[PDB]
């Protein structure tokens, strides 16, 4: 019966079993296995499991004593795929138009319109933008606009944090790049989003191997995978930062990333709307003038406005007052900014 063939396959196995990372096909079914530490005899494979599920160089089930290949690896549920594979198209495309409106149009006719209608390049012989770095001051809307395109979409969105790739094991992060771009390959036309890759360059750890020789290899696997070969076609990938100093220019160059998009901290003409909308869902003594707050901070982000418009209500509701006094706005803004120093200088144009 099937039971004896299954038991004989199970007794081809020797119950302490192991796992090792490979390199290359050795086409006539005898193989050779690195471990983590790589001790590599000319091993076999237990020929009822499928050798040809897998491309070259990936984890399989091994033995400890004759090292032989036993079974396919488990499709190992790392904590990335549950975050990488975006489950639902969440929310927040535009609750409130009037935050940017400059590069909303740009991200539209550079990310939606090439992708969602891939028939304009038929007329005019133009290549699509593969990577666009959306960047600027911290607290602008980059993560927000990422979620905005993530809901307002017809492509399978993907969302990646840059510290997801940082694990202490050897070759772990490159494998996570491999499974990451397998996720980026095998859904659909897809919109990958990557965030916090300026928090990867001047960065070293203690849960770590040799620092400059660890994520050089991981980001080099990212280099060799992202816009290398394995034909690009139609796979949308967006990377976002705050600063640009720690960026290797080998990835900044064309071929890999085409368009470079800043974001200005907004003018007062839209500060009035952002302060209004952040204050749109509370009770407030309407005699107070936000135009003080609007004119005051000269390089405000929207996290500033967020913390101000919420923390003034927090200072009022701290002593259970529904509506906010203007000196609670004083307390709020002088909590929010460490040393609110925008008066003279200047102050005395005047």
């Amino acid at each position: 019966k099937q039971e004896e063939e299954r038991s004989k396959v199970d007794d081809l196995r020797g119950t302490p079993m192991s796992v090792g990372t490979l390199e290359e096909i050795i086409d006539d079914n005898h193989a050779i296995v690195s471990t983590s530490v790589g001790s590599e005899h000319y091993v076999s494979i237990l020929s009822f499991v499928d050798k040809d599920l897998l491309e070259p160089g990936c984890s399989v089930l091994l033995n400890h004593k004759v090292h032989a290949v036993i079974g396919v690896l488990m499709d190992d549920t790392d904590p990335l795929v549950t975050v990488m594979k975006v489950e639902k198209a969440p929310q927040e495309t535009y609750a409130d138009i009037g935050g940017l409106d400059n590069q909303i149009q740009e991200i539209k006719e550079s990310v939606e319109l090439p992708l969602t209608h891939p028939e304009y390049y038929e007329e005019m012989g133009i290549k699509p933008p593969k990577g666009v770095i959306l960047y600027g001051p911290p607290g602008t809307g980059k993560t927000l606009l990422a979620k905005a395109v993530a809901n307002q979409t017809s492509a399978t969105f993907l969302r990646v944090v840059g510290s997801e790739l940082i694990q202490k094991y050897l070759g772990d992060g490159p494998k996570l790049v491999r499974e990451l771009f397998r996720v980026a390959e095998e859904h659909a036309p897809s919109i990958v989003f990557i965030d916090e890759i300026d928090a990867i360059g001047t960065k070293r750890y203690d849960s770590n191997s040799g620092g400059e020789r660890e994520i050089q290899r991981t980001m080099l696997e990212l280099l060799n995978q992202l816009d290398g070969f394995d034909s690009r076609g139609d796979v949308k990938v967006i990377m976002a930062t705050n600063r640009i100093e720690t960026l290797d220019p080998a990835l900044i160059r064309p071929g890999r990333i085409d368009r470079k998009i800043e974001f200005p901290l907004p003018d007062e003409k839209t500060k009035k709307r952002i302060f209004q909308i952040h204050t749109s869902r509370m009770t407030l003594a309407d005699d107070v003038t936000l135009d003080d707050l609007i004119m005051a901070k000269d390089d405000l982000s929207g996290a500033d406005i967020k913390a101000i418009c919420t923390e003034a209500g927090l200072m009022a509701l701290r002593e259970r007052r529904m509506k906010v006094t203007n000196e609670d706005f004083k307390k709020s803004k002088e909590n929010v900014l460490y040393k609110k120093q925008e008066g003279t200088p200047e102050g005395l144009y005047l």
């Binding site: 891939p118 017809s154 659909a188 036309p189």
Partner: protein, 689 residues
């Protein structure tokens, strides 16, 4: 106040203290009492006491209804004969009479089988006509015809709440949860109140579930009374089955009243506005003819491509694209290409004869037989293409005109659906009596007489299909016969509402699992779908049968059965291992609009290695979607780049670009793991406009 003054009033047994205390308790009965009625343990002793004792029945049903009881609670109301828009009326009428009369209707509806519950039921019906919130009172008063006089009693003013709300939730829940025999009362009394009402497609969906012949006469004197017009001719002809357009064209052949219903409601006027307007508002380009028509060569993929190009319909260009493409073609693909000029043009009646006429009576048997097949494809109201094929048909064993019998018996099955056409079946008696070794002779015999016979009056066990049962069990050879004859058997079983024909063919038929597979085919086709879960747990047990083809069709019945409550239709058939079962769910998705969960199942079903199952995925995969669409297609290019797989990919490309007419031909497709001779009929699943 405190219960100190009012509480010892239950202690005396003098009549005046009761007959003023109970009106005093009636004033406080607007909130029942101060509280949750803890007079109960002291006043339950007052049961044995006997003038205004029906007021004592009001107190007794008030307090027993106030705490809890299932049968003794409505006994003071059925003893009381209720006598003597308010908050108190909402209390003792709404919640107390609704729940109390509800448990009386349930307990006596399951218990006995009086007129008292009928009078109380009409009284509560009137009181909830006063309350005017239907929905819950309606679904309560279903389970006590009662519902008939309930509807004609209720329907005076409000139209769309009862119609839309009641007929929506109770039509959907009646096909969903409720068994069949009360749905006839839905349909007949809904025929009454919708016969009172306008917006006639409610009555036309009553014609969908009823299949009645009086209804179309009433809705044509009434829908001629309401003079769009050809558009209800269109979804009239789409909505109607095989029987009622021939009964409709015979009684309207008598009367017709303007003759424009003889114009519209037989044929040719569902189809005259579309095809020019198909050319007009749509503008389809040429680079899929050339590109999708460029996908290489190999007389198969190329042959399939001819079919793909052919089902393109911006003109009948691929029809008239020169010569030497069909000369490369071979026998059953020459059937497919000779019928493909049928497939490009399912209109142009006058143009059909003058395009097929070159390929009529040609040098090749497959050109002429597939040509008459194309004549059967293009139309269904001509019936003058019969006689050039009809005359030839007889061969007595296996000559040419039996292949014209395949295309012309099948294409004439495409052509007409009479009350019972009998002349073509008297032609079908030397067809099954002929019994060529070619499968599709008896194949299109059963399937074609089934297309004549779908929608029969609760089916029939007549000598036609009885004859093909006995002549079926005559010859046990080439088991495709033992599969496609129970096809047309179960097609004649379609039209059932209550048919015992599964028991009749169960007595006549069952044997060794060829005819037990006939038993499971009649078991599939006789059971279209209702709230009838007993055959779904029968499906659970006999799903585990060791013969693994009655598994195939018996589990394949699911997309027929639960097609409306489709949220349960995701099952763990992929989590099973009997690979044809993964084929069954792969069928069971099918073609409708196909949500993300369905394509998510095509995530795994897209990736499989057996060429009949990897062949089986793009067919329903691109039926369910009639980049995005072409993204799984290029993913299939990533899958292979066998020849079957290439053919499957071509089929998927073709797909990319309870009406029985869409129910038959894919169950005709369910034996695909076979010759291209079988695939010569693969292009006869004509289910799309």
């Amino acid at each position: 106040r405190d219960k100190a003054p009012v509480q010892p009033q239950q202690s005396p047994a003098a009549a005046p203290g009761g007959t003023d205390e109970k009106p005093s308790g009636k004033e406080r009965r607007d909130a029942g009492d101060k509280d949750k009625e803890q007079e109960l343990s002291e006043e339950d002793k007052q049961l044995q006491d006997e003038l205004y004792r029906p007021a004592l029945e009001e107190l007794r049903r008030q307090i027993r209804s106030s705490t809890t009881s299932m049968t003794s609670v409505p006994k003071p109301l059925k003893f009381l004969r209720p006598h003597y828009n308010k908050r108190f009326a909402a209390d003792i009428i709404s919640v107390l009479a609704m729940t109390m009369s509800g448990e009386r209707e349930c307990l006596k509806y399951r218990l006995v089988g009086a007129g008292e519950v009928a009078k109380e039921w009409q009284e509560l019906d009137d009181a909830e006509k006063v309350q005017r919130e239907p929905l819950l009172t309606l679904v309560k008063e279903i389970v006590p015809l009662l519902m008939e006089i309930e509807q004609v009693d209720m329907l005076e003013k409000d139209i769309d709440e009862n119609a839309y709300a009641k007929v929506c939730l109770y039509l959907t829940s009646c096909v969903n949860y409720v068994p069949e025999p009360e749905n006839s009362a839905l349909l007949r009394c809904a025929l009454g109140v919708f016969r009172k009402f306008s917006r006639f497609p409610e009555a036309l969906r009553l014609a969908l579930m009823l299949n009645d012949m009086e209804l179309v006469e009433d809705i044509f004197t009434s829908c001629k009374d309401v003079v769009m017009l050809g558009r209800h001719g269109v979804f009239l002809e789409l909505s109607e089955d095989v029987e009622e357009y021939e009964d409709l064209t015979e009684i309207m052949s008598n009367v017709q009243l303007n003759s424009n219903f003889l114009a519209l409601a037989r044929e040719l006027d569902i189809m005259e506005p579309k095809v020019p307007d198909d050319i007009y508002k749509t503008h389809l380009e040429n680079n899929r003819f050339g590109g999708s028509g460029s996908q290489v060569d190999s007389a198969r993929m190329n042959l399939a491509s001819s079919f793909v190009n052919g089902f393109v319909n911006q003109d009948k260009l691929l029809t008239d694209d020169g010569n030497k493409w069909l000369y490369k073609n071979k026998d059953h693909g020459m059937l497919s290409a000779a019928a493909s000029l049928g497939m490009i043009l399912l209109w142009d009646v006058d143009g059909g004869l003058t395009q097929i006429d070159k390929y009529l009576y040609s040098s090749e048997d497959y050109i002429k037989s597939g040509a008459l097949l194309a004549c059967g494809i293009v139309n269904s109201g001509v019936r003058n293409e019969c006689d050039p094929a009809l005359a030839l048909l007889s061969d007595y064993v296996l000559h040419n005109s039996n292949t014209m019998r395949l295309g012309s018996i099948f294409g004439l099955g495409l052509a007409y659906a009479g009350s019972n056409r009998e002349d073509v079946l008297t032609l079908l008696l030397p067809v099954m009596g002929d019994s060529k070794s070619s499968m599709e002779v008896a194949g299109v015999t059963a399937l074609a007489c089934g297309m004549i016979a779908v929608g029969s009056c609760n089916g029939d066990v007549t000598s036609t299909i009885l004859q093909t049962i006995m002549e079926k069990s005559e010859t046990e050879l080439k088991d495709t016969y033992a599969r496609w004859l129970p096809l047309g058997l179960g097609l004649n079983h379609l039209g059932k509402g209550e048919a015992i024909e599964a028991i009749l063919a169960a007595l006549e038929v069952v044997s060794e699992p060829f005819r037990s597979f006939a038993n499971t085919l009649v078991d599939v086709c006789a059971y279209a779908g209702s709230g009838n879960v007993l055959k779904v747990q029968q499906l659970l047990h006999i799903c585990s049968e060791h013969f693994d083809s009655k598994e195939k069709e018996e589990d394949k019945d699911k997309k027929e059965k639960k097609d409306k409550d489709k949220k349960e239709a995701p099952a763990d058939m992929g989590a099973h291992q009997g690979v044809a079962v993964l084929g069954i769910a792969l069928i069971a998705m099918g073609e409708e609009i196909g949500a993300e969960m369905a394509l998510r199942t095509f995530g795994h079903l897209l990736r499989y290695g057996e060429p009949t199952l990897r062949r089986a995925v793009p067919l329903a995969l691109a039926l369910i979607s009639v980049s995005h669409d072409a993204d799984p297609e290029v993913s299939y290019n990533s899958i292979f780049a066998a020849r079957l797989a290439a053919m499957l990919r071509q089929l998927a490309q073709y797909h990319a670009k309870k009406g029985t007419l869409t129910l038959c031909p894919y169950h005709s497709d369910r034996q695909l793991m076979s010759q291209v001779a079988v695939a010569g009929l693969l292009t006869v699943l004509v289910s799309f406009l």
